Amino acid sequence: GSSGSSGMQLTVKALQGRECSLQVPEDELVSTLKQLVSEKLNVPVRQQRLLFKGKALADGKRLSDYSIGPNSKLNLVVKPL
């Protein structure tokens, strides 16, 4: 497979922590957008949490619904499990 023309690039960065990029579409479900990274940093979705412009995403909705296009930098947060 090849990324670029189709889909978008998302770079998740944790507050003064770690980060990582991933290839996902524009209508990607927040539920999958998280599970994907969970494998990258080997962190459970239960802990790590994504944030956009101070907006809490719900596992299920689509980034497109939040008005988030390509080249979007998501914010990662650590929560106590």
UniProtKB/Swiss-Prot annotation:
Component of the BAG6/BAT3 complex, at least composed of BAG6, UBL4A and GET4/TRC35. Interacts with BAG6; the interaction is direct and required for UBL4A protein stability. Interacts with USP13; may be indirect via BAG6. Coiled coil: none annotated. The chain holds residues 1 to 74 of 157 of the full protein. There is a cross-link at K55 (Glycyl lysine isopeptide (Lys-Gly) (interchain with G-Cter in ubiquitin)). Polyubiquitinated. Ubiquitination by AMFR and deubiquitination by USP13 may regulate the interaction between the BAG6/BAT3 complex and SGTA and therefore may regulate client proteins fate. Transmembrane segments: none annotated. As part of a cytosolic protein quality control complex, the BAG6/BAT3 complex, maintains misfolded and hydrophobic patches-containing proteins in a soluble state and participates in their proper delivery to the endoplasmic reticulum or alternatively can promote their sorting to the proteasome where they undergo degradation. The BAG6/BAT3 complex is involved in the post-translational delivery of tail-anchored/type II transmembrane proteins to the endoplasmic reticulum membrane. It comes from the Eukaryota. Signal peptide: none annotated. This is Ubiquitin-like protein 4A. It comes from Homo sapiens (Human). It is found in: Cytoplasm, Cytosol; Nucleus. Residues 8-81 form the Ubiquitin-like domain.
